[PDB]
Amino acid sequence: MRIQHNIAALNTHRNLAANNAAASKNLEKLSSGFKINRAGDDAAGLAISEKMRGQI
Amino acid sequence: MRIQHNIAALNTHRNLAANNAAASKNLEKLSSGFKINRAGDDAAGLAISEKMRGQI
Amino acid sequence: GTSAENLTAAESRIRDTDMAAEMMAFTKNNILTQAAQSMLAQANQQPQGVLQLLQ
Amino acid sequence: GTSAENLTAAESRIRDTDMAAEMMAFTKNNILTQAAQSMLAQANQQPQGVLQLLQ
Amino acid sequence: SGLNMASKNSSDAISLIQTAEGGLNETHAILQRMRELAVQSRNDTNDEATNDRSN
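Predict the joint structure of the above. Result:
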C-alpha cells in the first residue's frame, strides 16, 4: 500500500518499455528501407513479394 | 536490455555497411565501363565474352 | 505484465502496511505508556499513613 | 551477422539489467533503511522508566 | 514470480524464433539466385561443349 510496492512506477516502466520497442522497430524499418523484414510483420505479402521478385 | 548492448545501432551498422558495399560495386562498374569485372559477377557470360573476343 | 501488476497491487494492499496509521497508533500508545507511568508513580506514593503512628 | 545480432540481443536480455527497475528498488530500499533507522532511534529511547525510582 | 518468469521465457522463445527466421531469409535469397541461374542456363545460347552451363 505505501512503501514496499509502488504500482504507478511499474505501469510507467511497462509503457516506457513498449515505447522503446516501437521506436526500435521504426528504426529497423528506416535503416533497412523495407517495411517487411520478418514474417511477423506481415505473412501475406512476404510470399507475394518473394514470388514477384522471382518473376522480375 | 538497456545499456550494455544497443541492438538497433547494430542493425543500422549492418545495413549501412551493405549499402556502402553496393555503392562501391556500382562505382567499379561505372569507372571500368564493363558489367563483368570478376567471375563472381557472372560466370556464364565471362566465358562467352572471352570466346567472342577471340573470334572478333 | 498486466496481470502481474494487478496481482502485485492486490498483494501490496493485503500484506503491506500504511505508514501513517501505524505512526498514529505508535504515538498514541507511547502517550498512553507515559500516562500510565505517571499514574503508577502517583499510586506508589498514595499509601503513606505513617503520620497516624508517629508525630 | 544476422545470427550474431540475434544472439547478442538474447544475451543482453538474459544477463544485462534494466536501469529503471534497479533504480526503483534502490530508492525503495533506501527509504526503508531510513525508516528503520528512525524506528531504532525511537526504540532505544522507549525504555526510560527511571522516574519510577527517583523523583 | 511465475508470471515474471513466464514473461522472461516468452522473450527467450521470441529470440529463438528470430534466429530461425534470420536463418531462412538467406535461404530465400540464394533460392532467388538459383532460380535466376536456372532461367539463364535454360536458353540454347549456352553450349555444353565449351563449358557454359557447367560454370
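Chain A is about 70% helix and 0% strand.
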